[PDB]
């Protein structure tokens, strides 16, 4: 499969999440994603095929993971936006007030602005600290997906949102949304990953 930020993958033939970013660790290929999406050694699949397994994760506390892929997978410096692509040019962390977009298999590609950093989300499993909050909308399934500026700078991966009864927060005004992502830089240093860019 071609690995592109934003696409759907399954975990153990059951939950869905979205790909965050292509990374390497030496010779191993992988993608970063949200830790609550799977547990270590869970099987990830894209388009019915096994692409790799969860290698490490931390959730709750933090919410991050990376999946090691087989050699057959094709890592790409891209995040999906409808039928088009956003190129990943780097990981400069943007500041509050910066405009930001995100990609995921449930709501697609949505943009908004970073509204706050170092937020705590209290999920059923326990607290997750140090998250950044933006007001681009998102829905269940978008977890794990890319947050990236239009300019190609990767910000992090989708953690959670204030879900409404329709399964997303796209029906309430941006003032009211709290969509949160896990910053990318700590995930990349923690596992010694290098981001694939173009």
Curated annotation (Swiss-Prot):
Superkingdom classification of source: Bacteria
Cysteine-cysteine disulfides: 17-37, 101-111, 137-170
Active site: 36, 63, 143
Protein family according to the UniProt entry: Belongs to the peptidase S1 family.
Name of the protein: Alpha-lytic protease
Organism in which the protein naturally occurs: Lysobacter enzymogenes
Span within the parent record: 200 to 397 of 397
């Amino acid at each position: 499969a071609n690995i592109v930020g934003g696409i759907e993958y399954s975990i153990n033939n059951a939950s869905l999440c979205s790909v965050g970013f292509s990374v390497t660790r030496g010779a191993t290929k992988g993608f970063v994603t949200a830790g609550h999406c799977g547990t270590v050694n869970a099987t990830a699949r894209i388009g019915g095929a096994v692409v790799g397994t969860f290698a490490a994760r931390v959730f709750p506390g933090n919410d991050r993971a990376w999946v090691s892929l087989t050699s057959a997978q094709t890592l790409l410096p891209r995040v999906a936006n409808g039928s088009s692509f956003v190129t990943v040019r780097g990981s400069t962390e943007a500041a509050v007030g910066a405009a930001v977009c995100r990609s995921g298999r449930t709501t697609g590609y949505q943009c908004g602005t970073i509204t706050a950093k170092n937020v705590t989300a209290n999920y059923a499993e326990g607290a997750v600290r140090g998250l950044t909050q933006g007001n681009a909308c998102a829905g269940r399934g978008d977890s794990g997906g890319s947050w990236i500026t239009s300019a190609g700078q990767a910000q992090g991966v989708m953690s959670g949102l204030n879900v409404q009864s329709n399964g997303n927060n796209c029906g309430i005004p941006a003032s009211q949304r709290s969509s949160l992502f896990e910053r990318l830089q700590p995930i990349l240093s923690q596992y010694g990953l290098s981001l694939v860019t173009g």
